Symmetry: C5
Subunit: 205 residues, 5 copies
């Protein structure tokens, strides 16, 4: 019990906190989605609501430690306030994201951080033709708001979204769901900005 | 009056706070539900609202004390911010939980903590056939979001939900309410996670 | 001006804060209600909204002072964060209470504290027969959530609710409003709990 | 640039903050109202919503300074957190006030403070006869909740509300708007309380 | 990594924070708008909702640094709390602005700051004749609430609003969108106040 207390004190209280990634010291964030439900569809304003949980995984050299020196400790859970977290944002959002999970992450001895946030997102989607047998398709882009491609890079373990936890008695059934990596070029800035496209094809009843 | 002041100072201000349970030092939480009302039912989005107060108790060796040394003090009330609390979360939730009770807990000399939070939860539930004499059945699982089975375990004193405080003039009548223990395996993670399944069978009038 | 500054410094900054009442050192809280309006009535969910301001006074030996020593100061206003406040809660609520007044209280040299919070409460009430000449009757109980009868007692100066500030052009007119002290017994615990039952008889127009 | 930095440091960081007005050291707050819009009218609950920006100015001897000593500085803008602010509250409110302007005030060398908060208030108002050519009249009171007349007093520069900034294409047209001072006597307390009565006469179309 | 840490410590922790612009030391803030969607239109209350992200850039002599002294660092990302930000406010707003982007800005060695906040604003707009081929026109002014013309001056790089990121399948199509600089004279104050008028002409389908 005392060994875990001194590990946290040596990592956070002793050393100064991480000031984000540089173009000289970049970072790579692994992502992945778990779709749970398509709760609401509004035809009069063209905005659809989703319930899901995202995967936020990365590695830091500052968070590395030897388990033998701290009594065979391999990993530990800590508050999200104690460590740095990436600024992944949904671009086509209409209303601010509602958090449905605690703000805790888990760190491993190799310096790898794991954070899984539960969310309710309202985004821009035209649902014309949801009643037909063919269905309707909608998409949303996720990525850093401030960091470019030279500071933060995104990767996906699989291109298929996990639907094993999707709500059986939902008002809308999923036909296809994919998570694919993209490289954007905005008119504002010459620097490219990497993102992940969440594409969902759904139909009524 | 001075004896209670020095007990709190010796426990919190002197000793460092608990860093959560480890696989070497696990914890067991006792969970219990008191259903008060089924306030709203939405057919167009399949989401139902419940009013209830949950029961959560655990024991810690750090919170133990001798009553004779502190002037025969057996127990005391303290703010939830002063102590560690488990991360019990509802999985099938659609919107964030609303707290309806103060953030206070009561600690005993044996190191046992008692916390009773009042909540209003909106979760995924298809209410097709609530008007019928047979009624409709719905469920929701509660458990830790970050800690696995090796770190946190759950237990229930009884499998029957307390309906002695249920609202008499409610729009819906309860037919059966049960709180049963479960051990889950998710597609994400090899570690098994323990939860409590709340199952309610209700009907109109 | 300097005399009021040193009085607050001697009471709060010098002495440690009150750790709540004990079974050896109990407290008695005086409670009052001033009904202002019955703003909303929902028939589909059986929940009613009230606008009112509650009265709460209690005395503490720690907050006592001599006026002659601090330049004839009899009383002073201070933030609710600087002092201890009772955990009075409404039991039959469906949604969290909305505060409509500042978080300030007034303390007197005898150690008596005065706190008057303005609130908007939505509680459980069946409004069937509000349109009739007879009207409809509803009740809500206010009491401590954590402290038992041996720790906190409740008393009322009068059993008649103050309706002198009730809204004249309201959609609902009051026929009778009473505040009475009652002792509850919960199956959970052997300790009895005290509350104040707010009973209101109202009619449409 | 350095002169403004040392002025703020000498006033706030050096001297202790103002503990509010006393019966020995009173304060007078000048109030004003600029009506912008009557956005919503609810007939089923008798509650009307207004968009406006309130004016409040007071003087403090502690905030006085010599401009020649600090490089000809006459005034400066500062956060509302850095200084004391009066507890002006709307009495007939139904839901909490929404702030629509930044929390900044401007202080002058004579110790005079200027604060202009933009608000959206929902208050008690019966709108029966708004569709009539005569229109409907409603009123709301503003004043201190805790300090009485002997501590804080209120005054108005003019009795006519500023409608020069009122929304032209609004659903409701103003017929008359006045701001008048009052002295209210409460049964609770011996000290009388001062307020300002905002009376508005409006009609539909 | 250590070079970026000592740069932030030398700029913020060592030197006192900027106390805003003076009439002796004024500031010029460049403003821009990127319209994304016209999500909702309410005819019963005359209030329209927009989704967009604002551009704001200014320069400060205090935030200047030599890149060679800190290991060739040209720029860095930092929290909006660490630096001063202008008080740009929408005047015709009906409800508080919702933030849809992280609170981070990017500072360059020349002392130039870049801040891009994503927002959802509800403002006063009469939508009578949106169904017609001609459409309907609406405007909203943006500018400082406390600082005048002598302290803060606003400028625009172009008078044409960026519609390259506007939602294709929106319920309303844009006919014209312009951002123009204005100098307003209010009845309250002899001081002139500068704003940017955002004028949008839109039609249904
Ligand atoms: O930096 C900018 O926008 C940032 C980068 C990318 C593009 C949008 C979002 C936030 N991610 C910017 C700078 C000047 C003008 C417009 C946008
Ligand atoms: O750890 C994860 O999710 C946690 C554990 C369990 C499962 C959901 C909830 C939160 N409780 C995770 C790890 C990789 C991918 C997806 C989820
Ligand atoms: O202590 C408990 O509930 C408290 C005391 C009383 C009864 C409700 C409310 C909060 N006031 C409790 C403890 C275990 C199981 C059930 C209730
Ligand atoms: O102090 C009180 O109410 C305050 C003063 C005035 C009246 C209402 C509002 C708040 N302004 C009080 C004290 C005991 C009993 C009733 C009211
Ligand atoms: O200073 C004032 O209002 C400020 C300046 C401008 C005008 C509105 C908004 C906020 N910007 C004021 C001062 C006395 C009476 C009314 C308004
Ligand atoms: Cl949390
Ligand atoms: Cl609380
Ligand atoms: Cl407050
Ligand atoms: Cl602010
Ligand atoms: Cl943020
Ligand atoms: Cl208009």
């Amino acid at each position: 019990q005392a060994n875990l207390m001194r590990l946290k004190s040596d990592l956070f209280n002793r050393s100064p906190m991480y000031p984000g990634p540089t173009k000289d010291d970049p970072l790579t964030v692994t992502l992945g989605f778990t779709l749970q439900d398509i709760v609401k569809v509004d035809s009069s304003t063209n905005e659809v609501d989703l319930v899901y949980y995202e995967q936020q995984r990365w590695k830091l050299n500052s968070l590395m430690w030897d388990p033998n020196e701290y009594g065979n400790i391999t990993d530990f859970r800590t508050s999200a306030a104690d460590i740095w977290t990436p600024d992944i944002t949904a671009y086509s959002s209409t209303r601010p994201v509602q958090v449905l999970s605690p703000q805790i992450a888990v760190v491993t001895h190799d310096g790898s951080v794991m954070f899984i946030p539960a969310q309710r997102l309202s985004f821009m989607c035209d649902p014309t033709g949801v009643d037909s047998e063919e269905g309707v398709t909608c998409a949303v882009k996720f990525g850093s708001w401030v960091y470019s491609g030279f500071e933060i890079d995104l990767k996906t373990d699989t291109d298929q979204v996990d639907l094993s936890s999707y709500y059986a008695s939902s008002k809308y059934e999923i036909l296809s769901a994919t998570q694919t990596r993209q490289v954007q070029h905005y008119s504002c800035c010459p620097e490219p900005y990497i993102d992940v496209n969440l594409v969902v094809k759904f139909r009524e009843r």
